[PDB]
Write a protein that binds this ligand. Structure first.
Ligand SMILES: [Cu+2]
Ligand SMILES: [Cu+2]
Ligand SMILES: [Cu+2]
Ligand SMILES: [Cu+2]
Lengths: 555, 583
C-alpha cells in the first residue's frame, strides 16, 4: 500500500497478450492440444484470493468491496456511496481500471502459486503461461457454441460448473476435480455477521447469504435457504435471451434483444462520448448507450424480484447479487461481464476515434480522480490516482482484444458476431426502423432499483414482467440528473400492426419494484420513433402511457 | 461384518416407540427458539460420515444406495450381477410387484439403523464426557424423518423439504455452547470425488453401452460426480454434467402438477398429487394387490395405487427428459437421478420419499386392517425373500432373509408415525392434511366425479422410461409435456426397470394407474358446449418425442356424487404431434 495498478508487467517475450472469450478459452484449455495450465492457474489463483482473510486488502472480499458495500476504505483511500462510478461519463474508465486491478491481482497470485507448488522442471513453462494469461471476457451478446442436436445467448460454460478439473502440479497426467471459484463466492459465515466494519448489512436479505446467488432469494421460503440460494443458470440464460413476447408464437423468428442492442451500440455512428459512455442525461436515436445495456445484463444475470403478488405455479422471479449495485461485485461473473464492457468500449473507441470526453457535457468529468486506484506518475514522479486519459489506450495496461488487434476487419467481425440474426430476421419486413426512447430518474424510488417494462397492446394486469407476459416488448433496468436508454422496436411494431390493421402502437409501460408490484408514482418518459430505412431521420410517432394493473398487484 | 442383522434401532425403555417426524416440522423444531439442535447436528454429522466411508465398506452411503440398482454388486454376501430374462441388469429392489411396499420398508429401516449407529459413534468420538448422556438421549429418540410430498408446506403449495433445498446447514460444535458451523448439507446431494463412471472397479456407474447384453440407462450418469435434479440437458458442455445442480424450484413446479386450465385467470388450483394421495388413503374396499403395486393381473376405481403415486413423485423430483425438439427459450426439461431406477437411491431425497411411502403404507394398513396379501394374486408373493436383507429367526435359530410378514407391524422395527399412533383421529387427520383443498374446490361444481383409468406395459419401450400424458381438447403438436401444455389433464410415469425375474426358470405383464379428472372435465365442458371430452394421450420419451407405437388403454369414467358405481363415458385415443416431434 499504495498498491500500484500497472496491468500485468511488460515482458518482451509476451507482446500485448489478449483477453480471450471465456468460452473459447475454456474449450481450448480442455482440449488435448492444451497443457491445461492457464485453466489450472486461474482456478488455483482465484481460489487463494477468495480464501484470503478480510484484513488482506487483496482478498476477493475486499476487492469486490471497492465497488459498493460494505463501503469501507481501500488502499489508504477513505471510504463510505461506494467507489464505483455509475450514471456518469467516467463509468467506462473507472471500470476499465477496476477490471485491470482484478486481473493484476490474479496474475500475482498465479506467480505465487507457481513458487509454492510447481516442480523445477515445470516452473519456466508455468510462468510462461501466467505471463500470457489475461482475464477472459464473457461475450454476453454472442451465440454460444453447441451441438445443435437453435442459437441462443448463454452464461459462460465455466460459470455454470460447480466443479472444475485441473492439473495437480508434480503429478504428471493427474487431474483433480475441485470447487470452481467462478461458480460463486462463498464465505464461511453469513455476510451479515462478518467482523466490523465489513458486515454486509437493503430490501433483499443479502445479510442472510453466505454465498452469492443468481435468482436464489425468494420470499416465503425458509431463511436458511438464503444462506446459499444456488446458481439458477438456466433461469439467467432465459432472461439473457429476452425478446418480444410475440416471437414465442408459432411461425415467428426470434432475435435476442441483447444482441440487437449490442449490434446497434457498436454500429451506430455519430455519438459523442457523453452519449455512448453513460445513462446520464442532463436525439433519441443516440440513447442506446453502453451503461444501459450493462444495466440490463446485471438484472438478467442476478434477478431483482424477491416476490410476486398472487398465486403462480411457475415462478420466474427470484433475486441475486448481480442485480444489486452494492453487492454485484461479489459474484465472480461480475468481472467477466465488466471485462466485456471494457471490450465493447475498446471496440467503440476504435470505430469512433475522435470521440473521447469530447462533448461539453462529458468534458467536465474527464479529469476526475478514479478513486481508489493508484499508479505511479512518470510525468510528476509521485503516486497519484488514475485519471481517464491514463487509460484511453487500454494497451498501456498491457492487454488487448483480438477484435481490436486486427481492427482491419472490425466492422465485418461486429456483423458476424452480433448482426447476422438481426439482419436475417429484419430483412423479411419493410425497410423502416422503430426505436423506443426511455428517460427516468434513478432516484425515483428513493434510490431503490426498479424495472421499466414496455408493452404494445393490452397488458395482463397480473403478468407484466418478462417475455412470457402478453404483449411484452422490452425492459430497462434501473441499476441503483436523469437517465436514458433505448430499445429496438422494429419487430414488435410489425407484429402489433398485423393485429391492428397497420396502426402504430401506444407504448404502455409499467414500473415494477422488487416485490413484483407496479409503482404508480415513478415518472417515465417513453416514446416510439420511426425512420425510413434499416438501421444497419427518426420522428416521434407515439407517446407513452402508464398501463394499469390488477389492484392486488399495485404497490 | 456379515451378516448385518437389520433390527431397526434397538429398544430404549426411556423412549419405547419414537416417531419418524415430518422433516419440515422437525427441521423447524430443531431451529426454533427452545430447541437444542442436537438431533439435526447428529443427522448431518452421521450422514456425512456414512457418505465418506470407502467403497469396500458395505455400510457406506454408496454401497447402501447400491443395493437398489446400479452398479449391481453383491451386498452382505448376497451376490449381485443379476440379469432378467431379457439380459437386463437388475438390482435388489422390488418394483411392479406386491412386495413393493415391504421390500422398501426394510430398505428404509436399514438406512435409519446405519445412521443411528453412526450417531452413537459420533457421540463417543466428538462429544465431551459431560454431554454424552444428553446427546445419546437425543440419538435414541431420533428416527428418519419423512418428506410429506402431499402436504402444503408451511397460496398453498407442495414442496421439497426445506432441508433438501439448503446447500449448507448450521450444526452445533459439541464442546462449545452457542457455537455453530455451516457445513455442506449431506441431504442436498451426494457427491463423490470423481465422475461416477470412473470409480474403482467394480463400482463404476456405467450403462450397458459397452456391456454384453441388456439395457439400464442412457442418461449420462457416468459423467456425473454429483447427484442432480433436472441438471442433465443435451447441448450443454459435458463438464456441466459433473454437477448439474439441484433445481429445486423446478422440482417444486413439477410436484404441483395440475390441469392446464387452472393457470388461467379466475380458477382455483388443486395439486393432482394431493388429490391422488387423498383418494388413495380414503377409498375403501381395495385388496392388498390393488393398493400395493402398479401390477395388474386378470374396476378402474381400484386402480389408484401406492406405487403409481410413488412413480410420479420420482419423475417430478428428478426429471427424465434429456432434450426437447425444436425452439424453446423457456426450458422445462432436464433430467436427474430420481427419475431412474438404477441410480435414484443415490439422491438423499430418495430415502425421505420412501420414508413417506412407508408412512402411507402404514396409514392404509391402519384403515384396511384385514387387507394384507389377502387376495389370490398378491398372496403368491407374501413369502418372497426380501433379499439382501438379513435377520435372525428365533424359531429356527438361523439367519434368514426378511419376509413381508416380518414387517406387517412396522412397530416391530421400533418406529411409528404420529398419524398411526393416534389412530382414533386418523380420518380427520387425513382430511386436514390432504383433503381440505380438494373438497373446497370441488364443492363449487356439480355433485359427480370423473376419473381416468390408464393401463400400460412397463416394458413397452424395451425397459426405457416414458411418460403418458392425457389431454382434453386439441393437442399442441409442439407442446404436449406438462401443465404449461394446452389442454393438459395429467400424467402417469413409467418408472421403468428390468423384468426382475432373474430367478425364474427359462422354460416356464400390465401396469395400472388412475388420475382424477373431475375438474378438467368441468373446464372442457365449459369450452365445448357441455361435450364430454375424448381423452387424448401422448407417450413421451426421454428425447421429448412422441412414441406412436406404445399402446395405452385410457378411459374416462363417471359416477354420480363426490368420491369423498363408476360408468365408462369415453374411450381414449392417441393424439398425433408435429412431425419433428415424432419418435
Ligand atoms: Cu459498477
Ligand atoms: Cu456493472
Ligand atoms: Cu425402489
Ligand atoms: Cu422408489
Amino acid at each position: 500500500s499504495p498498491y500500484l495498478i500497472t496491468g500485468i508487467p511488460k515482458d518482451p517475450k509476451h507482446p500485448l497478450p489478449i483477453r480471450k472469450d471465456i468460452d473459447d478459452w475454456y474449450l481450448e484449455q480442455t482440449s488435448a492440444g492444451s497443457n491445461r495450465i492457464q485453466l489450472t492457474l486461474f482456478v488455483e489463483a482465484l481460489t487463494v484470493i477468495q480464501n484470503r482473510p478480510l484484513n488482506d486488502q487483496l482478498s476477493y472480499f475486499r476487492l469486490a468491496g471497492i465497488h459498493g458495500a460494505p463501503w469501507t476504505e481501500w488502499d489508504g483511500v477513505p471510504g463510505g456511496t461506494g467507489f464505483c462510478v455509475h450514471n456518469n461519463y467516467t463509468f467506462p474508465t473507472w471500470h476499465r481500471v477496476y477490471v485491470t486491478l482484478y486481473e493484476q491481482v490474479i496474475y500475482e497470485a498465479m506467480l505465487d502459486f507457481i513458487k509454492q507448488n510447481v516442480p523445477q522442471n515445470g516452473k519456466a513453462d508455468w510462468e510462461n503461461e501466467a505471463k500470457q494469461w489475461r482475464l477472459p471476457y464473457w461475450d454476453f451478446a454472442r451465440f454460444a457454441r453447441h451441438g445443435h442436436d437453435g442459437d441462443e445467448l448463454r452464461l459462460p460454460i465455466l460459470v455454470t460448473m460447480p466443479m472444475v478439473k485441473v492439473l495437480v502440479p508434480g503429478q504428471p497426467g493427474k487431474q483433480l476435480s475441485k470447487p470452481n471459484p467462478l461458480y460463486r463466492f462463498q464465505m464461511q459465515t453469513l455476510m451479515g455477521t462478518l467482523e466490523r466494519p465489513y458486515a454486509i448489512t437493503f430490501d433483499l436479505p443479502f445479510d442472510k447469504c453466505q454465498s452469492t446467488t443468481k435468482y436464489g432469494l425468494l420470499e416465503n421460503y425458509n431463511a436458511d435457504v438464503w444462506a446459499d440460494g444456488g446458481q439458477n443458470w438456466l433461469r439467467a440464460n432465459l432472461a439473457l435471451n429476452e425478446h418480444p413476447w410475440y416471437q414465442n408464437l408459432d411461425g415467428w423468428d426470434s432475435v435476442p434483444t441483447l444482441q440487437d442492442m449490442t449490434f446497434r451500440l457498436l454500429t451506430t455512428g455519430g455519438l459523442n462520448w457523453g452519449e455512448f459512455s453513460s445513462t446520464r442525461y442532463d436525439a433519441p436515436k443516440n440513447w442506446m448507450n453502453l451503461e444501459a445495456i450493462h444495466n440490463n445484463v446485471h438484472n438478467w444475470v442476478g434477478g431483482f424480484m424477491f416476490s410476486r403478488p398472487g398465486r403462480h405455479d411457475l415462478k420466474l422471479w427470484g433475486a441475486g447479487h448481480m442485480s444489486s449495485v452494492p453487492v454485484a461485485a461479489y459474484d465472480p461473473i461480475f468481472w467477466l461481464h465488466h471485462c466485456n464492457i471494457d471490450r465493447l468500449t475498446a471496440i467503440w473507441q476504435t470505430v469512433n476515434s475522435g470521440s473521447w470526453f469530447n462533448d461539453d457535457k462529458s468534458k467536465v468529468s474527464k479529469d476526475d480522480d478514479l478513486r481508489p486506484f493508484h499508479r505511479f506518475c512518470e510525468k510528476t514522479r509521485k503516486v497519484v490516482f488514475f485519471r481517464s486519459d491514463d487509460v484511453k489506450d487500454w494497451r498501456s495496461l498491457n492487454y488487448d482484444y483480438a477484435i481490436t488487434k486486427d481492427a482491419s476487419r472490425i466492422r465485418k467481425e461486429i456483423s458476424d458476431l452480433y448482426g447476422q440474426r438481426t439482419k436475417e430476421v429484419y430483412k423479411d419486413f419493410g425497410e423502416e426502423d422503430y426505436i423506443l426512447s426511455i428517460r427516468y430518474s434513478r432516484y425515483a424510488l428513493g434510490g431503490k432499483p426498479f424495472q421499466i417494462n414496455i408493452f404494445f397492446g393490452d397488458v395482463d394486469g397480473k403478468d407484466f414482467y418478462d417475455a412470457r407476459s402478453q404483449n411484452f416488448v422490452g425492459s430497462v433496468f434501473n441499476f441503483s440528473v436523469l437517465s436514458v436508454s433505448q430499445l429496438p422496436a422494429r419487430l414488435a411494431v410489425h407484429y402489433y400492426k398485423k393485429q391492428n390493421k397497420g396502426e402504430v402502437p401506444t407504448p404502455r409501460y409499467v414500473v415494477v419494484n422488487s416485490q413484483g408490484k407496479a409503482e404508480a408514482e415513478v415518472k417515465v418518459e417513453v416514446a416510439l420513433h420511426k425512420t425510413e430505412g434499416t438501421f444497419y431521420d427518426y420522428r416521434r410517432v407515439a407517446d407513452g402511457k402508464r398501463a394499469e394493473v390488477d389492484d392486488a398487484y399495485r404497490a
